[PDB]
Every structure is written in C-alpha cells, then in structure tokens.
Amino acid sequence: AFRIEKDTMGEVQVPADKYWAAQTERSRNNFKIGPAASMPHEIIEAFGYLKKAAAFANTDLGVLPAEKRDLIGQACDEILARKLDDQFPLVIWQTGSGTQSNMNLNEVIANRAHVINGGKLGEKSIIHPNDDVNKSQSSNDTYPTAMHIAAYKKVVEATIPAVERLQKTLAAKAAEFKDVVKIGRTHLMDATPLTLGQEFSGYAAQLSFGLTAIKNTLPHLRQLALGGTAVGTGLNTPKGYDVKVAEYIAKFTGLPFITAENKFEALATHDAIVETHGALKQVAMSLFKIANDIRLLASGPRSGIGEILIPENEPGCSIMPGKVNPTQCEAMTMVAAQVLGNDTTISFAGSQGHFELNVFKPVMAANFLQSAQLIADVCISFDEHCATGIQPNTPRIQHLLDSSLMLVTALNTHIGYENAAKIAKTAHKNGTTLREEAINLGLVSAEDFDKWVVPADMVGSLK
Amino acid sequence: TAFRIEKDTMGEVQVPADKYWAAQTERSRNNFKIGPAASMPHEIIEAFGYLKKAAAFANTDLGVLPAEKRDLIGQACDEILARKLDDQFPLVIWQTGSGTQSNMNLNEVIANRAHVINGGKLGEKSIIHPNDDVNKSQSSNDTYPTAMHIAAYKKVVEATIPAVERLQKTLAAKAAEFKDVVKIGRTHLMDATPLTLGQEFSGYAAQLSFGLTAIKNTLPHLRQLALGGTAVGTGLNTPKGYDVKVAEYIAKFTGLPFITAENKFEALATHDAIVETHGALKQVAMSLFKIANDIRLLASGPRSGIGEILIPENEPGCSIMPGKVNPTQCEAMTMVAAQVLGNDTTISFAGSQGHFELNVFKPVMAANFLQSAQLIADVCISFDEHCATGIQPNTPRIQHLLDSSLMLVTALNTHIGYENAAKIAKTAHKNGTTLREEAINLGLVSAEDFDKWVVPADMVGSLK
Amino acid sequence: AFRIEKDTMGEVQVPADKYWAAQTERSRNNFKIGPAASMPHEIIEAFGYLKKAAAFANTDLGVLPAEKRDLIGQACDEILARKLDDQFPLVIWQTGSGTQSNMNLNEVIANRAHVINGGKLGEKSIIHPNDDVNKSQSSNDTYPTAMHIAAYKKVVEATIPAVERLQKTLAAKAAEFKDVVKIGRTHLMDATPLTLGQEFSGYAAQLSFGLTAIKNTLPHLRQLALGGTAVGTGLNTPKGYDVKVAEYIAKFTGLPFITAENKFEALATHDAIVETHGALKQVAMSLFKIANDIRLLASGPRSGIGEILIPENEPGCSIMPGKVNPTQCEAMTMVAAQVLGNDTTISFAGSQGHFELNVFKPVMAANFLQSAQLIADVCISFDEHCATGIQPNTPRIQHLLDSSLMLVTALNTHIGYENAAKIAKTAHKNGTTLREEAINLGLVSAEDFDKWVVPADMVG
Amino acid sequence: FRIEKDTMGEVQVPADKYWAAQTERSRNNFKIGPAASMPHEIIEAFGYLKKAAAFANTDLGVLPAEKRDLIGQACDEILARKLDDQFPLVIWQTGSGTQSNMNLNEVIANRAHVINGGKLGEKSIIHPNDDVNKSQSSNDTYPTAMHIAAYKKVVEATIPAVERLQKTLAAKAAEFKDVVKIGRTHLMDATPLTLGQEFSGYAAQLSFGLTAIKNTLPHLRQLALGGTAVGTGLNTPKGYDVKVAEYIAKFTGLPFITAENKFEALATHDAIVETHGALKQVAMSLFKIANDIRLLASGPRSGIGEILIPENEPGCSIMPGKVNPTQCEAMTMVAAQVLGNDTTISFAGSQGHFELNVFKPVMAANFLQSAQLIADVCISFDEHCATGIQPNTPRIQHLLDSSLMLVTALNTHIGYENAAKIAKTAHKNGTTLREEAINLGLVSAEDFDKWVVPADMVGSL
Ligand SMILES: O=C(O)/C=C/C(=O)O
Ligand SMILES: O=C(O)/C=C/C(=O)O
C-alpha cells in the first residue's frame, strides 16, 4: 500500500503507513546495498538532538514560529525516546554527504509534527521538510554534527569508562601480584626474573597512556560544524546561530560541545574522526598485545607455559572433551584486528575530501562508531569474564623461574660477561644447573652464588 | 522470560524455555555481549546447515551413524536452510576465535529441533546427542572453516562475479557506443591529447575484465574444504574416506564444485585462501573506486566543472541548494571501496596471526570477507542500473574542451621537433590565440601542413 | 685482509682495517637482507648520545673508572661528528631487538677507545665491549632509547618546523585572498560562494589541528627505557641510574627526555611510536587533501578548473611540448600514501610484543623516521616551490562564480526551497540565467533578484 | 657548472655530469628523502626499453641506424652499471616519473655525443626528445620500466627464494614424518600430529602463495609501451607496440607482450596491486611460519623447546650465553613491511585521474622493496634456520604424554561426556589420564593402553 509524495523531481510511491516522504523512499530503492537500515542508530539519535537545537535557536533568533518549534521538538523527543526507529530505513552506502539521512529526519519530523497536530498522514504537512525542519541548515553541517555528537558521546560514555574499568583491574592485579617472582621472556627465550605484578603493571601502563591519547583528541571532536550550512560561510543562518545552536546541543546532551573554530575545516575534512580513531587504534594494538600475553601465560594447562590460571567460563571444544580455552582473549584480539582495518578505511576516507565537502561521511561514521562500541563491549567482557579472576599458577611459576639458565645474569657485575657466559653454556651443553658449573669451573663459591643468584633480588637495582 | 535447565560438561544453565538452543549457546550469548546480538553472518549459519546435513549422510554411508538419526539431523538442517529457525542463532562474531560456540549452537539447535520433530518434548535430552551424533566425526576446527569456504565461494560465484560481469559488459557497450566521440585526454589533471570517450570507457571495461580473472584465479584454493581434519588436521575420529565422502555431499547439496583440502593442516592453521580471494576483491575495489571517481569528475558542474558526460539524475542532491543533482551512485561505490580496503587490512592481519594447529580469528575473517563480497555485488548492480547504463556525452561541451587544448601541438612532434612545437604552444598561451595562427605567424608550419598533421580524429591512433 | 676477533661463540675473521668485531661481522654475513648498512644513521647518532650518557652516569655512580668514561666519550664524540659512518654496516632486518646494532656500537667504541689510548687494532682492547661500553645496559633498553631520541629529535627539529612553515604560508594566503570571491564545490558539483581566502583558511586550520595532534604525543615519546635492562627491572643498574642517565641524554641532546614511568611498557611495546605516528598520519591525510585541491584548482589551463595559477618549476612532459604539471602537489600525495602504509606497518608490529619485549624495534624505527623525514622535506618543497607563489586566476574565477545556478540558494529565505528549485531547474534545462527565469516564472522582481543574489554578500 | 637549456630556459648543470637541464631541475626542486632514491631496478628496465624503442624505431623506418647504435651503446653502459652516478633523482618526484624519463633521455643523448667524439656542453647529435624519446612518453615508458623491473625481480629473485624455502619445509615434512608431538589449538594442549605433518602445513602454505603469485604474472608481463601520451599511441609507427615488446622479451629473456588495453595500462597500476596482493599473501604465511618456529624453539628450559634451531650468534649483550631465533624476527619484520607496502600500493592504485595514474614511483619503490625483502629473508631464513631445524626428541615426548586431550581417543569407545569426566577429574586431581580413566572405571588398564596410543592418533579409523 502506497501514497504519492512529491519532491522537486516529481511523484514517488511511499509505503502508506510510513512517516518518511519522497526523498527517503528514492534512497531506500536507489541504494539496495547491504542490510536495510544500516545507518547507525547513534547517528539518528544525534540528529534528534541537533534538529531540536536548530528549532530552539531558530525561534530565539526570529525565523521560526514557537508553534512549529514545539511540533518539531516533540517529534525529536519521539526519535530520542526510540519511538520511530522503523521510520529510518536508509543504508550507510548512500550519498557520501548523508543528504538522504538528513532528509529522512526532515520528512519524518514534518509528517509526524502534522499528525501530532491532528492532521492525516499524506496531507501537505503544516511543517515544510526544507523551509521549517531544515531551516538554517544543510546535510553538509548537520551530518558532521551528528557524527561528532555520536562519536564524542560513545567515546566518553562507553569507550573511556570500559577501558578505564580494565585499566584498574590490570593495576589491581599488578598490586595483588607484587611479591610473585616469575621468569621474564625476551624473543620467547628464557630471560631474567620480574614479579607477575611488574608484568601486569606494564599492561596497566599500556591502557593509561592509551586513555591519555584518547582524551587528548576530545577538544577537536567537541567542535560542531553546525552553522557552516552548504560550504562553511553560514549562508542562510541568522547571526548568533552557530554559538546559540551549540549551547542547546550542549544543554540537551549534557556534554561540552562548542561551535567549530573553522567551518571550512569542519565540512571539507573529518580530520577530528581520524585524530580520535587513531587513538582508539593505539588502544586496540595495546589491547591485542595484552590479550595475546594472557593466553600465552595461561597456555596448557600441561604442555604450554601455564604460569596463570584464568576463569573457566565454558566448554572450549566440541571434540576435545574437557578442553578449556582463553576465549575472552580471542574476542579481544579479533576486535583489535577489526579496529586496525577500521583505521585504514577512516584514514583513506579522510584523505579523500574535495573542495568544500568530504563526501565519505557515512563510512567514516559507521567505522568510527563500530570501533568505539566494540572496544567498549570487549573491555567490559574481558574484565568481567577474564582479568578479574586471573590467579598465579604458583608451582609452575616457581619451576620455570628456577630452570632459567639466565639467572646467571646476577653474576655479571661479580665475574664479568665472559665468565658468566661460560657458566650458562657449560650448564646448557652439559645438561646441569648453574650452581654446579659455577662451583666446578672455580668461578663462584657455593656461598656467593647462594647470596647473588636470588630472583627476589633481581627484580630491582643493585644495593 | 520462561526457563528450563540444560547441562553441558561444566554445569547447569537456565535457557529460554521456547528456544531450541541449549547450555553452551546460552553461555556464549551471556559471555560475549559485544556489538549487536546475532551478528554471526546468516551465510555462515546457512553454510553450517549444508555441512551438518552432509556430515550425517557421510557418517551414515560409512556405517557409524544410523539412517533414522541421519533423517532427523537432515530435517532440522533443512529447516535452517529454509530460514525457519533464524531466531535460534543469537551468537556474535566476537566469540571464541575457533567459532566453537556457533558450531555448538548448530549441534544443540539440530539436536533439540530433531527431538521435537520425532515427538519429543523440548527440555528432554534429545534422541540425537549434540556431540556424539550431530557433531560425529567433526570439530569446530574443520566445520567453521568449511562454513567460511562454502559462504565465501557461494557469495563470490552467485552475487559478486555476476554483478561485476553485468557492470563490465555495460562499460564495454558504452565503449562501443562512444567509439566515434572525440574528447580531450587529461594527465596530472592538465589538458593533454585526444582519445575517444569510448577508448576512455574501454579502460574501465578492461580494468573489470582483469578484476574478474584475478578473482576467478582464487577459486581453486577457495573450493577446498577442511572438513575431515577434525581437532588438529590428522582426521582423528573420522571413518576411512569421510573427508572425500562429506565433500561429495557438500558439493551435491550446494550445486558448487567443492573438494576436500589437499592439506588439512593448512586448512585449520591458516585462512590463506580467504586472504588470497579478498586480495582480488580489494584489487576490484581499487579499480571501481577509480572508475566511479572518473565518472563524477567527467559529469561535474553542470557549469563550473568538466561536464563532458551526462549521468541519470536519480534524486534531489541537496536539502539547502535547490535543484542541485549529485553523483550519489559514484559516492556509494567510492565509499564501499574504502570499506573493502579496511576489510583487507583486517583479514591480512588476522591471517598472519595463526598459532600451531589453528588460526583462531575465523569469525572476524569470515564477517569481513562476506561484507566485501556482498557490498561489491550490490554497489555494482546499483551503479550499473542507476548510472552506467544511462551515461551519454555532453557533445557541445566535449567539442569546446577538445578544440581549446594547446597540446594538440604534440601532433607536430614528428614534423618540426619537440622544441619548435613548444614555441607554438608557449606563444598561443601568452597571446590567448590558436595553435594554427602561431604555427603560421612564427613560420614553423604552412597552413596546408598544419591542417594535414593536426587532425584530432587522427591523433586517436598510430601514424597514418 | 682479515684479523681474528672472538665472542662467547668462538672465532671470527673481521676485515683487518675495521673497528668492529666478531658480533658485527656475524650480523653482516648472516642478515644479507636489503641494501647494505640500512640501519638509519639517526639510530647510530642516538646511540652515540646514549652510550656517552651511560658512561658518564656509570662514573658518577662509581661503577666505571673516569679514564674509561673519557675514552668512551671521545669515541662517541667521533660517532656524533660523523667520523665513523663506515664502521656501521648492519641492516634494519637483523635481530628484532636491535641486539646486533647495540653490539656494533659496543665493539666500535671499545676498539676505537683502544687506538685513542695508544694501542693497535687487533690487540685485546683496554675497554670491554660488554663489561665497560655496555655497563648497566641491555639492547632491550638501549635500542628503544635510540628510537625515542631519533624520533623526538626528527619531529621537533624537522617535521613540526616544516609543517609550521607551510601552515603560515597557507594562513598568509587566506589573508592575501580574503576578498577573492569564488564558487564553492560540494560533490564536485557547482555550489554557493566562499572566498579563496576562506578555502585556504580551511587548509591553514587542518595543519594547526595536526600540529596540536603531533605535540599531544610528545610527552609519551620523550620517555626513555634506559635503566630497564633485560626485562624492565633495572637488574644490574646502580641505584638512580635510570634518572641520572636520562638527565645526561637530555643535557647532551638539549631535548626534554625523562626516564620512562614504566620500564616494562617501554620494552614490551612501542605504543609511543604508534601514538606519534598516528598523528604524523593524520597530518599526512590532511596534506593529501590540501595538495589534491591545489592540483584540482590549477587544472587546465583551458579544459579544467583553472581557478589558481601555481609556480611553473619545470617542463611537465617529454612528449606534450609546453605542458606544465603541478609536480609539487604529486610529490606530497605520494608521501601521504607512503605514510598511511608506514602506519599499517607500525600499528601491526606495535601489536606483536611477547612477554617482556617487542622484537620489531628496527622495522618500527625505520618506518617512523621515514614518515617524520618525508613529511618535513615535502612540506618545505611544497611551501618554497608551490604554496608561497599561488595567485588567483581572477577572470576565470569570476566567470565560474557568475555561471553557478546555486547562487539561487540566496532566494531560500525569500521565496522558499520549492520556488528557488523551480528557478534553478528551469535555468539549467533552458541554458538561460537565474535572473531571466526568476522573472519568466514571476517569482522575483528584477530589483529584488539584484539586491538578493549578490555573491560578495553570500560569504558570511 | 655548464649551461644546459630546456623549453623553460637556462640551467647551471654540474660540468662533468651526462644529465642536463631537466634532470638538474628535478635534483634541486624535490629535495625529499635520501638522494637518488629512484630504484636502480627502474633505471635498468629503462636501459632495456630505451634500447628496444631505438631498435623498433629503426625497423619501422623513422630513426636512422646511426642514431640507434649510439643509443644502444649508451643503454648497454647503463645496463652494465657504468653510469649509476648519472641518476640523482628521488622517488618523490612528479608522480608520472617524467623527470626520470628525462634523466634517461638526457644521459643517453649526452653519453651518445661523447662516444661519437663530441664534448659535454654541445647539444648532442642525438635529441633527448626527438631521438631518444622518439615514439614515447614518460606515460608509457615508466609503466614499462615498472613492469619489466617488477616481473624480472619476482621470477629471478622472489619466486626462486620462496621455492627454495618451500623445498626445505617439504624435505623436513619427510625427515620428521614419524616424530609424534602434541598439537596446540588456542595455545592449549590438543591431540597428536607428527612434526612432519606440521611442516607439511608450512610447505602447503608457500605452495598456495607461489601459485597465487604465478596467477598474477599474465597481467604483469603486459607492457604499456606504444600508448604514448594518453593510450592512443599518437606519434607511434603502425606495429611499434608489438615490435618494441618483442625487442624487450629478447633483450630480457622474459615473455613480455604489448598490453591488450593501453588506457588500463596508463590510467591504473592494477597489475602492481594484483601481484603485490599475492606477495602480501606470501608475507602473512611467512609471518605465521616464522612465528611458529620461534614458539616451537622457545626456552631452552622454560618455554616449549620442541625443536632445536641453528645457533648463529650471541643472542644478548647482558644475558650471557642466551641464543635467539634471530632469523625468525627478520622474516616477521619483513612481513610487517610488506603489509604496509600493500596499504600504500592499494591507496595509490585507487587514485588514477582520467588518462594517467600519477602515483607511479611510490607504487614502483614499494613493490620492488617487498619483492627484494621477501627474496633476501627467504634465502637467509632457509640457509641460517630452516635447513638446520631438528626435533628436541626428549622434550617432544614429555609434552606429548602430558596432554589430557589424548582422552579424545576414547570418544568413539565411551562417548563425549564419559571422556570429559576422565579429563576433568584428572585436571581437578592433578593426576594422569590413565590413573583416573581406571580409577572411575570408564576404561580397563588393558583397553586404555590399547586405545590411547599417540602414534595411532595421527590418521583416520
Ligand atoms: O544536502 C545538503 O544540504 C547539501 C548537499 C550538497 O552540497 O550537495
Ligand atoms: O570445538 C572444537 O571442536 C575444537 C576446539 C579446540 O581446539 O579447542
């Protein structure tokens, strides 16, 4: 069942029930690319905030009647309350400006305003999509505004807290394991001792510098395009609109948005998405390493390293009965893989602006949100279902520590490099302990080796 | 909201009473809340349906599974292939790197659904055991990569290759249709020498021809199925010849020419075949990005750009600039190509990351591969129907830009030398005059020789 | 032609005239990968700084005799003054830790120290390559200290000043072209007016945001691993070594280096290299865009955009006589493409640390240093040879501005979107003017059109 | 300095150099990266194609035999490396590589003049544009240099280096076919396979990667030469395109042909994207294999240590006597480079405009570096690690008998849930599989000893 709606290109059959109009319907038919309604919901939600702020600012500045403001603001409250999700059917792989998603907000708000006000769907709306819902605005400033609201909100409300959660667990464990002495590995080969705390303190540190990197990118992402309209000059905006509309969005979201300092930079680039995604990708590579270590540390339990015990959450294996796997770690390394390709896509798209407009906005949008959501979700899962339950395998730690021929490094400042090297290669060649060959080569007394080669004394400076 | 108690080897689990999945699926659903729910691509669940039926038929032919049990497994698999059990697969991509949780989802749903088919009550342990019967002779470690290769191969020969062929042939037809339209070439974006619009479009059609061969070259590796490798590649716990027998049944049920992998260790420890065929997809993506980007430069304007071609005007371009029309079909294609490039970074990185007997990045690789295959398919169809089939020359515009170009003076090279031909062009440039005036004014060429040697239509081929 | 040197593995035939020893020679023969001596000179230089620092630190802490500090320092002063460049033949593609280059420094300092003291090359050195030159150090903490010193020095002495010089030319051009009204383009299609000034003001702002993104990463990049030794613990360092040695690096380099907060993160990762390189790659994607716009605006001169004129530095074409190309633009887009792939390499390698050490140190070092370098060089080349010489093509600009149908956008707040659309659509189909069709459709008086459709008035 | 002149005016050129005005402008105007970074491999390919051009130009009646011989001699001098200091131009030049095309054109013509008994500082008897560049553009020559140089390096260095490693890994799959070890999945103890079988996997990887590379050669052997300015072959004699490709096959000993479509051949580097894709597939495979061999080799006493590898140098300046899998690191580092090289190449591949892709030098440099590094580290790794790999036999047997997942052998006897009871109880009690199978009475001692045999677990029932 259809009704005819009209745009400046003529007549379009629109599903009779649906609040969208001609432009939303053409796009839904002209971009049959991947799954329906793939435009992020976070982008639509952002549009809810800024269309409502546009309306509010336009009335304060004398270009929209209060009557129309309130109908727009109520239809935006419905979008925000998730009452109209079945009214946003457009894909990511549309016009690169996101014009069709902007007109989807505009047509849905106008037709929904009309029915709120007592009219029939398919009657000329009391609210015009272009002249009223879109007054003072372009797809070219509204879509980048939706991008930064969705991006800033997800990064500060989901991603930073989730990464902070895992950072504090990792720092907690580092503290909890400060007196567990273990064997280091460089190049995967037996090395000198460090505490399990020291190992985890490295991991805690990785996310601390990553959190700082992400925070450093927020001043740029807080800047909103809204007011630059078609090309950044703010043609067709009342004076004060850029500052005023950013105060509404700031009031409505609770987040410290400001108007962009250079609206030509804010339309022709998404350098801010590149900037913040770069830092997300810094954290994804640190996360990869941490997850990879932890499965290596848990490997076995009998014929691997097996120096830690991780929580056992599920049957690991359909054929190998009673096998248990570090499945939280695999989740986290696969998210990290995804984030790095997301960064290729964003970097590539960011370089591809032409003149006044970057037209890679949706794909930049979709990839940034997916990275920020997946980092958030996997740090919560990995913290809950792995990191918090990590315990030492004490006897395994103690065996692999004691077997290291490279405890011989404690001897370096006492007998010199070459004499230390003779002891280790003699023990290796002969199949004996350091302590035997140190004594039998006449290079160290039994009491000096017992005093010097003490792993608990090899996890700090001399004294 | 109602519950029953299922058990696995780790303990009891509350499972939604109405659902056909069991304890392990319910564990995964609650333990891997990462991204949207049910993100594991339907093409993989579709592929598992094919391979699980084949497994049961193979196991029955080699006398290790009773026929009655093969029948019940086949009917539940058939209901998965007919899309009647889509609500019974809620597990995400970002699960165990092996896909063990999705393999158990299939096993559990086939077991319980089979139980109910036969007259049993959901909640009861099934006449068909999830591990000992549905999973007989199999591992997550050979089934998941078998599902990846079935889904990958099917999507490439049924969607992707057909779509790219469709667009290639349109660009070939437009090459033939525009063979006599002479236009100006551009190199480094500056005015150059003549070629036909048809020659320009022949570039585009040839790029997709070399694309189609590059992808087809990758199918030999992709048709190969890990099924029978089991846990580590050795085929532990398989009947003699199960590996070949199950590949025959997967080939028989899909209609596609699948074969058992030459080396099950390569088939479990790597997804080199997925890296291989994605690489070809990314080559096609890079070509398509270029063709699309050419078409928007060629149509740009309509007045203050190049504007040498007219494209179909599909929709209002702009909410604030009234009557603007944009190259939206070109923008969708360039945006997909950018996606396919990240996909390739992701797949190549995961592909390097296998350990000993198993690569545990299988879902991320599968998910990225299928998105690439599917988007390339859809955007090529969208672009063929809504842009390429409708492209026509702006003939007045083309002639103006062709007749303007100072580098028609290149045609003088063989007659008067580079150095004299350059004087003509620097003079005609300084003076705002034509090449012919300054070639005659400077006395470097007669009227008769200029007219003889400087024919745009002759400059589209070898010396005549 | 060869003399005998030994390591803990046995005897090696070393070229008799060279200052290196058994380990360098082994490395030279066993890693025949890429062009000879690929380890970047900046890593060697950084090493020159930190080996001197270590020696000076070791003496103030009473574990190295002053006579041996003096010898080691003189050898290091010779490295720093590029006297010893033919004593370093090892490749990037060696051990993942850079152990072999560490020992290259150790052996050449030790041997050079011997000869400075009055001995002869081939005699046992008065200075030990492990016990003295490498006292209190690992390859594990030295080679990251080398990377950070080289990477910091390059970014603050080369990359940032190059990028700052281009930013300022771009900003001068924004003020220079402040009243030059041109047509906007969105989707490559004719749009509404902005000044050439404003357009360049977007460029200047891009590089202002990039400079901020790079500097934000400098606090992490100035942290030095030196003192972590083998695994991060500072095994076999005197107390306060980590902090005394960073101060000497800082004093000798004149750069704000500090001992790392966490030595296990300093050894097990190169997250500082990933952070900073991410910022270099942001700037790189900004420069691509800017360079691609300038070529698009200069395109033609008769069959393109033609809105700017760029310096003409050279014949552009061996067959098309008199043709001239925007060749600086091309160099800058090619660098940008390099830096994106350098970023894939650094990110990927950055993820592949095991336990207490990332053993990708040189591949991360060489990609990093190339990006900092190529971005500094191309920013200087593009500034000198293109950006400072850009001029408007004013006749062409004006032609292209007054042709634009989307000047009609100016009618929106007066006659609405649908009426403005009917004027632009009608003008486009009939090949007539906006003004003509405004009047033919009865929608705007000729007076109102000429008051309302003013390009100079559409620019904010 | 001497004065040389181009169509733009006078240039002071180093008085002794065979290069001229345009080479000298490039040298001064693109001070980007280290000096003379244009790969020598491109210069060599230029020497082959400039000579083949002269040769074809003479047969087709449009260049005098005298001028052919002077260009051929200069070209043979470039080919044999007598003129490497006559090529001072960087990668980071004009994206067409015109300036390097004009470097070849200026050096051939000045060097031809001195052979013919002229002096540097006279116009050459041989015009760099009209004679050495006759029937040519940078637009077709540079992509011809690229393909010749790419194809040559791949078939003469990369493929043989990869096939040599492939051969060793195959020979090790035989050497070790009867050495039973424990497999790991998820880094966790699994079921047996032979160390032969595991190396069979590594051999299979490089076979597939080499096939993938060889599949891309039919594209890469196609030469742009004859397209000239925009792909039309403006100013080429009829047949020039086929005849010059014949001359190039003959000089090189490789089967080059003229490209089927000169527009594809100028406006794209799709053949580089194609072939480098397959280099990249091989590098990710090599990454996995190098990574496996350091994990298997790890220890000696506190890691896996299931293989011994050749000990080629002291591992560590502070950890005395330590020995590292240094060959594995070089290979994994090379692999990291090839991945990022593939990003650069793919980016540049997308960025052609109208009739010409002007990303040519950066595509070329990145391709040739991947092909050279894959070749160098594959020979180094085969010679200094792969050939000398041996099983650590006592260690293999300890780690094999330790795995609780030998219990898998009991699936088809007692079924999934009973097998898991034994492994879980064993894991819980810190006891042995045998102990607990027997202890719970799910298997007799006699049946267990017959049923749980690692050597019987590396094949089908
Ligand atoms: O939709 C807009 O507001 C703008 C579109 C464009 O610049 O084409
Ligand atoms: O689910 C499986 O069959 C295998 C899992 C594993 O190797 O751990």
Ligand SMILES: O=C(O)/C=C/C(=O)O
């Ligand atoms: O060269 C070093 O000091 C350390 C090397 C290693 O960990 O093996």
Ligand SMILES: O=C(O)/C=C/C(=O)O
């Ligand atoms: O150098 C050439 O032959 C071509 C250059 C160009 O097309 O501009």
